[PDB]
Every structure is written in C-alpha cells, then in structure tokens.
Design a protein around this ligand. Structure first.
Ligand code: ATP
Lengths: 835, 58
RNA sequence: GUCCAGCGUCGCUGGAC
C-alpha cells in the first residue's frame, strides 16, 4: 500500500513516509548497516538517472537517526567549492556535532579534559593540510616529518595524514558515545570532477572500522570516470608512436582490467544495491509484482477511489492516443513504465492537472501539450518541428516522413510502433502518435486527406528504394519532398496530380497502362482497332456522372499529354468537397478545380437541356451528403493506427492487380461477360473497390467507438479479380450488428459516410465492367441488394440492371463509355481461352 | 468582451496601453504563483516567434 | 466429387454444392 499524490509539489524534500515508494528496499539496508559493525565496510546504492536516489538516501539517514551509530548530515559533492578538499568538509561537519555535545555535559570535571584533548587533535590535523593541497615538495617541512610525539607514539614516521585522521574518529566516538559514525555522499550525476575526489578520499582515508560510507550514483558514470583517469598514467609521448592495431588492442584490455579491479576493490560486490525501476515494483497485469501503488486524480480523493498506476496510464494512453483496449495499447504503457521515475510523474502529473482545470474537451491536445514539454530533448535529436503556434495539419505530414526516414524502416515505420532500437527514437514515436490523433479529433474528412499525404507519401518512395550509394540518398529525399510538396500543399488532389508523374516515371516491364492504382486512357486515335474498341473521347460521357468522371482525370506533361484515370484523384477530391460547407457554390468548384488548368511536368529524377443545370441534379445530392458528413463525422475518433493499417491493405491490394492483369488484355471483352477478361472499366473498378475494401476491415478491427469488433472468425482476403470477398464481409457484418441491435452509423461510422458518396456511386458498377457471370450473378445481385440497406435511397430503380446484366437505355449514375476505351501497349494477338 | 480603442486621445504608437491581450494569460500565471507559496519554484516563459518578450516580464 | 476463389516461384490454400 503506497499511495501517491499528484497534487502535491512532489519534491524530494516533501516526500513523507506514506508517499515514499521504496519502503521495502530501504528496510533491507537499514537493518544491514547495523549487522555489519556488530561483528572495507563501504556500501553503494545504485540506480539510473531520475530514479529517486536523493529522496532515498534521506529516508535511510532519517530512519537511522531515530549498537548505536550517529549519522552526519548528507554531503553533495557538486555544490561544494571547486577547490575545497573532501577531508576538510567532513572535519567541519564532525566538529559541529562534537562541539555541540560538549556543551551538553553536566560534569564540570569531565568538560575541560576532553575538550582540550579534542582541541589538540584538530590543531594536530590543521598542520597536516600542507600535504593535501600542494604542488611541489619543500625541505622546510622535512624536519617537521622527522619529529617524535608523545601522542600515541605513532608507529609510522612522517606526517601520514591517514593515521592522524584515524585517531580523530576514535576520539569523536568517545565524546558522541557511539560505536561508529557513517559518512554519506550524494550523487555526482551532474559532474565528473566531484566524483574523483570522492573516490580517492574513500580509498586512502576512510579505512578504519569506526566509519561506514554509503555512496550513491550509477556505475556507468563511475566506470567512465575511472577509465579516463587510467589513461592519464600512460606517458603522452608513448601514445603517438606504437599506434598499430595489435598494440592498441593490447593496452585497451589492460586499462579495462585495471578499470574493473579498482572499481571492485573500492565497492565490494556483496554490498551494491540496485534500485528497482517502476516496472519491477508493479509487474505485468497477469504477473505478480511484490508491491502495490495507487495514485490520486482529485484533491481530497478517498483512498478507496485510488486506482492502480496501470489504469492511471492505460486510460491516458487509450483515451489520449485513441487506441483500442488491446495489445497495441499495452505496448505503449509497458514501454512508458520503463522510464526514469522523475519523467513518469511529470508526464502523468501534467496531463491530469490540466484535465481538472479543463472542465472548470479535446483530450488528445491535453496529452499533446503535456508530453511535448517532457519529451522535448529527444525531439531535437530526430530534427522534428519545434514551433508550438504552428502545430498545423500539414506540419505533421513532414514530421512522419522524416521520422520514418531516420528510423531506417519503411515497411513498419508508418505504424508508429515503438520498436526502434535507439532510445531517442522510442521517445518521439509516442509523441507522433499523439500528434496524429490530436489533429483528427473527428476531422471533417481530413482523415481522408491525412491518409494520403501522411502515409502515401512514404510508401510511394519505396519505388525508388527498391532499385536504389550514400550521396544520392539525401539527393533524392530532399527534392522529392520539394517536387511532391509535402509540408506545403493546397489540396489533396493537388498531391495526387503530382503522384501520376511519380507513378509513370518507370512503367511496368510489359509497358501496359495498368499501374499501382492507375489506369491510362488513350487520347491519340490508334490505327486499326480490332473489335468494337474506340478511342477514348471526352464527350460521350453521360450527365450527372461526368463530374465523377471529371475528377478521375489527371493529365501529365511528359513530352506527350496523357490522361491517367486515378483512384487517388477520386479519393483526393473527396477531401475538397467535404472541407467546409457554408454555401452551395464551391461544391461544384472542386469538380473542375483540377481540369484544364493543372499541368504536371516531368519529375527531375526522370534521368531518361441547357446543360447548365444537369450538374445541379447531382449537386443537391452531394449537398445532402455533406449534411450527414457534418452530423456524424464530428462524433468519430480517428486513430494513429488506422492510417498506418488502411494503407498497408490498400498498397498490397493494388500491387496484386498490377501484376495480375498484364497478360490478360485481349478482345471479346468489350462487354465483360465473364472473368479472366480485363477491360479498362473493370481495372479501375478494382482500385475503387480496393479502397472501399481496406477501409471496411481496418475500421472494424481498430477504432474507438467499436469497442468489440464485428467480423467473422476466418481468413481475411482482398478482392483482386472477383467481388465475392467484399460481399461476404458485408454479410457477416449485417446480422451481427442487427443481432446486437446496433446501427451501422454508430458502430461503423467511418465506412457509413463514405459509402453514400455521390462521387463513387457511378464507379462501383460500370455498365460493361460488371461480370454477367450466370453462376456468379447471384453474387452481384446479393452484393448490390445489401447496399440497398446501408444507403436508404436505393436510387437504382431496378431498370439499370437490365442493360448491364443481359450481356437503348438512359443512364445517370453509371458510366457507359470507359468499356470501349483502349490502353497503351494493348496488343490483341490472342483471345478468350476456352471454358 | 475586450473593448479596444484605436483613436486614443494621446494616440500612442500601436495603441499598446497595458495588458493588451495577455491579460487572461497573466492572471493564470499570477494565480499559480500565489497558490505556490500556500523545493523548486522556478517558472519559465518560452521564446515565441523570436519576440523580444522583455515587455512581458515588465 | 467437379467448380468458383485466394497465396507463392506450377506449388499451396480457402469456400460452396
Ligand atoms: N517515493 C517517491 N514518491 C514520489 N515521487 C518520487 C519518489 N521518488 C522519486 N520521486 C520523483 O523523483 C523526482 C526526483 O527525485 P530525486 O531527486 O530523489 O531523484 P534523482 O533525480 O534520481 O536524484 P538526484 O537529485 O540525486 O539526481 C521527484 O521530484 C519526484 O517527482
């Protein structure tokens, strides 16, 4: 039972007996000094930086104050004057209590005899300080050394300050009436010259049986200090000559041999005490730890209300960083415990103190402000942003990219997992996880924007990592930031426009228009097209779906203007419309904010009706979509792991399509009856389906509102050539939410809003891209009928199926021109294999 | 509401008179100092935007 | 038993009747 108060100043001086956290280890030492002298006798407490050494020493000394040993006031070697010897200080401290007990005597006879006897010793020692502080010998004091004395008849001739001080302690014990006197030194953890004088004095002077010394510090400083002093003994001239590898390693071992012998001789092994960190005190949740600590989060809070430190940090990590109650949030609290105890409260105390006055909520910014100050020195080592008034959304995107570059890992870096071997990178990893969760705070589709720039900007660079030698690393990593413009940007689709050139700089080995989430639609009329394929003409696109088609265009000036159909432009655009809703004026701007004006140049690293109201029919639907967007998206709590995980599914999914539809481009596919036939309107259908697929699995797994997942207990796969993988996940989700009487809008909010997106409706069912698939027609009918419940509109009218499922008609929410479009490099030698 | 005048009778440069807008922040700092007395006691004021910030101490 | 689907450099795996 060790209760702690987070409202007290938590200073070492104010630490009482109730709030002390090292009751067990102190007792092991209090009852260990007494047993020593009763039958070099120097002890050594040990602990890391910020482990509470000073507040622990004062507990031992205070306990011993209340067979009999007296304790001097503790000495801090750092605060002492730079040139004052240690022996001078100890004598003054001893003289204070010796010259205070004499005034306590009641017998006049037993006052002057001892006082004069004691007074003689001080004058005897005062004449011996010549040897301690001097630079050269002087013959004038030779005669003083050769002197006979009637005091104890010193066996050893000369001065020999060791024996002069030895009898002084014996006299002090008689006056103080105690068996032995303890000298306690404090840590040198801020200096490397206070330690050397402390170490030397213990070796030479404090050797008698009437003294017990209790040092304090950590061996790493002491070990580093001694080894530096041993090299000084080697003659300087010897160290320039004889520098051979065999010679250098010869003395390298010998110095380290003298390092360990001297250190072991001074502090015996059977007396060192290691101070337990926060982990061993508490232990694991399932394991057993031999203590129990509870904290306070309220003034005058009842001790019954106090809760374990694991819940005091788990709740902060879970709520502050917005992670699920699981192993992922268990790694953060476990790592956070393995920190100096000084830093632990300053993170913990600051976060809770602000929370109390916050109510008088944006919990992540409370932790963001609190943790930034604590882990501020580790930030500078990785070169992150330091301005506080510029904690902008785009500022974070630069930070993640430069962090993963330093972490030397692109496959896991965007997960923000504190698995980095360096301790500095571990500290900043949790801070970045706090920044990501703070900026979202139920952001109005900024999560969609932050998903692309935050993580896509990282893994796209893996393309250059694959084929790429030290000077070039900073050569590309710098200007690629400049060209792609991360940290400075105006819109999500603006980034996606520059991505097309990045994708198209090096194509697939078969020189085909399919890429990673990219489809090329030819604009130059190729000659003698076999079959019904025609050149992609911009005009034939139907109304109310041209706007969706308009966003999917991205022209790249790379010696020939070629338009690229991209899911990135599609998803990049959704950030633009859902940015802010005040009027229905800029809603149509983003549909053409990237057309006929946005030109993209070759990357430097190449090295080689009236029709004025047809849009307004869809605008009211997009306007109503923002009404649901601006009602539920405020209530979501996006996380720092979804963005690292949604992309990972998406990146692998697209890479499967890229190498699966290369050799399968051939005629008799203008209508897309069956599988194994690759048309342009189906290849793009997969990429938009892949985006809708990765979001579903990740939201169900990791979120905040979804306390417990809603998905089947089976294999998790990605639709690459079919649609059955997507629909079955919908089916198992369906009854499970209805069984618990939980709606989709609350349990799965992130998927719900984006499903009912008017932009993506006319690309989920291309008219000629949908497989006829008399066997698998059951899938698509069941695939679509399920969507009729997730979106209550059911705008299909049941007639648009007939034209696209029987192999003129009027279409509004379906594109009827991509099927006949062609793709560069699409040789048409072979045809459908027999089935 | 923080009422701010522009055409001051003396018309000082920039119309900076006292506790311009930092009044809410100053009261937060002052109250903490008063509560502190009722043992490190050092506070800190970080350098913002490179501002001279000497006028804050005064 | 045959089919659909999925992963690997054909091999391996998943689902249904
Ligand atoms: N038993 C304890 N209860 C509460 N807080 C503690 C305790 N021990 C240490 N601390 C925390 O550690 C901080 C520093 O304590 P202390 O000075 O003893 O540690 P140290 O930094 O290892 O020592 P030193 O000052 O010798 O370098 C305190 O301000 C307090 O926040």
């Amino acid at each position: 039972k060790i209760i702690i108060n987070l409202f007290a100043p938590n200073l070492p001086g104010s630490t009482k007996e109730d709030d002390l956290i090292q009751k067990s280890l102190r007792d092991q030492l209090v009852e260990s000094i007494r047993n020593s002298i009763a039958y070099r006798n120097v002890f050594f407490v040990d602990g890391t930086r910020g482990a509470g050494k000073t507040t622990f020493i004062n507990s031992v000394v205070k306990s011993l104050n209340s067979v009999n040993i007296k304790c001097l006031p503790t000495i801090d070697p750092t605060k002492l004057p730079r040139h004052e010897p240690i022996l001078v200080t100890v004598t003054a401290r001893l003289n204070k209590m010796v010259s205070d007990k004499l005034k306590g005597y009641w017998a006049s006879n037993d006052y002057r005899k001892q006082k004069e006897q004691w007074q003689n010793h001080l004058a005897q020692l005062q004449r011996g300080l010549h040897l301690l502080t001097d630079k050269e010998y002087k013959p004038e004091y030779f005669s003083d050394a050769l002197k006979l004395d009637a005091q104890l008849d010193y066996s050893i001739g000369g001065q020999d300050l060791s024996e002069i001080f030895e009898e002084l302690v014996k006299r002090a014990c008689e006056i103080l009436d105690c068996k032995a006197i303890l000298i306690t030194f404090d840590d040198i953890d801020t200096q490397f010259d206070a330690g050397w004088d402390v170490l030397e004095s213990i070796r030479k002077f404090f050797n008698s049986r009437k003294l017990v010394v209790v040092a304090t510090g950590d061996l790493r400083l002491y070990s580093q200090l001694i080894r530096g002093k041993q090299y000084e003994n080697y003659s300087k001239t010897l160290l320039e000559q004889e520098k051979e590898s065999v010679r250098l390693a010869e003395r390298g071992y010998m110095v380290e041999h003298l390092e360990q012998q001297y250190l072991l001789k001074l502090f015996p092994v059977q007396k060192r005490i290691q101070l337990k960190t926060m982990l061993q005190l508490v232990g694991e949740k399932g394991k057993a730890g031999k203590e129990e600590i509870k904290v306070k989060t309220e003034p005058g809070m009842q001790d019954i209300d106090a809760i374990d430190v694991r819940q005091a940090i788990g709740d902060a990590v879970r709520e502050g960083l917005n992670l699920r109650e699981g192993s992922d949030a268990d790694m953060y609290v476990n790592e956070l415990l393995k920190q100096p105890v000084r830093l632990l409260m300053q993170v913990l105390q600051d976060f809770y103190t602000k929370k109390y006055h916050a109510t008088s909520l944006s919990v992540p910014n409370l932790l963001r402000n609190a943790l930034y100050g604590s882990m501020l020195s580790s930030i500078y080592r990785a070169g992150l942003n330091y301005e506080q008034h510029r904690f902008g959304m785009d500022s974070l995107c630069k930070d993640i990219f430069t962090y993963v570059k330093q972490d030397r890992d692109f496959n896991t870096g965007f997960y923000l997992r504190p698995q980095s071997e360096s301790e500095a990178l571990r500290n900043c990893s949790i801070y970045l996880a706090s920044q990501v969760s703070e900026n979202c705070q139920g952001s109005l589709s900024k999560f969609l924007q932050m998903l692309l720039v935050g993580c896509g900007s990282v893994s796209i660079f893996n393309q250059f990592v694959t084929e790429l030698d030290r000077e070039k690393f900073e050569q590309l990593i710098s200007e690629y930031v400049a060209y792609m413009s991360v940290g400075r940007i105006e819109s999500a689709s603006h980034w996606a426009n520059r991505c097309c050139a990045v994708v198209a700089n090096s194509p697939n080995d078969e020189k085909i228009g399919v890429f990673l989430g990219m489809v090329q639609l030819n604009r130059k009329s190729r000659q003698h097209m076999p079959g019904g394929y025609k050149k992609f003409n911009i005009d034939t696109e139907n109304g109310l779906a041209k706007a969706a088609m308009a966003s999917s265009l991205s022209t790249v000036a790379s010696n020939n203007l070629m338009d690229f159909c991209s899911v990135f432009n599609l998803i990049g655009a959704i950030a633009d419309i859902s940015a802010c809703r005040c009027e229905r004026s800029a809603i149509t701007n983003a549909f053409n904010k990237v057309i006929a004006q946005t030109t993209c140049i070759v990357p430097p690293w190449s090295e080689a009706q009236d029709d004025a109201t047809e849009f307004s029919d869809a605008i009211t639907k997009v306007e109503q979509w923002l009404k649901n967007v601006n009602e539920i998206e405020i209530g979501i709590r996006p996380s720092a792991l979804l963005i690292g995980k949604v992309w990972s599914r998406f990146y692998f999914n697209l890479n499967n399509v890229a190498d699966q539809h290369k050799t399968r481009l051939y005629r008799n596919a203008e209508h897309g009856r069956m599988a194994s036939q690759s048309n342009a309107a189906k290849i793009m259908r997969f990429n938009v389906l892949a985006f809708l697929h990765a979001v579903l699995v990740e939201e169900s797994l990791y979120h905040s509102v979804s306390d417990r997942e809603y998905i089947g207990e089976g294999l998790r796969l990605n639709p690459v050539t079919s649609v059955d993988e997507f629909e079955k996940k919908i089916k198992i989700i369906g009854e499970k939410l209805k069984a618990d009487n939980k709606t989709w809008k609350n349990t799965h909010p992130l998927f719900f809003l984006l499903i009912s997106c008017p932009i993506l409706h006319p690309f989920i069912f291309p008219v000629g891209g949908i497989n006829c698939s008399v066997k698998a027609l059951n899938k698509e009918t069941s695939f679509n009928k399920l969507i009729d419940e997730i979106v209550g509109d059911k705008l299909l009218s049941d007639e648009e199926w007939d034209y696209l499922t029987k192999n003129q008609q009027i279409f509004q929410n379906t594109i009827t021109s991509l099927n006949s479009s062609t793709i560069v490099g699409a040789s048409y030698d072979k045809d459908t294999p027999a089935r | 509401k923080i009422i701010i005048n522009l055409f001051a009778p003396n018309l000082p440069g920039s119309t900076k008179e006292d506790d311009l807008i930092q009044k809410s922040l100053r009261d937060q700092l002052v109250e903490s100092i008063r509560n502190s007395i009722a043992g490190r006691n050092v506070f800190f004021v970080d350098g913002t935007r490179g501002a001279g910030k000497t006028t804050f101490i005064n």
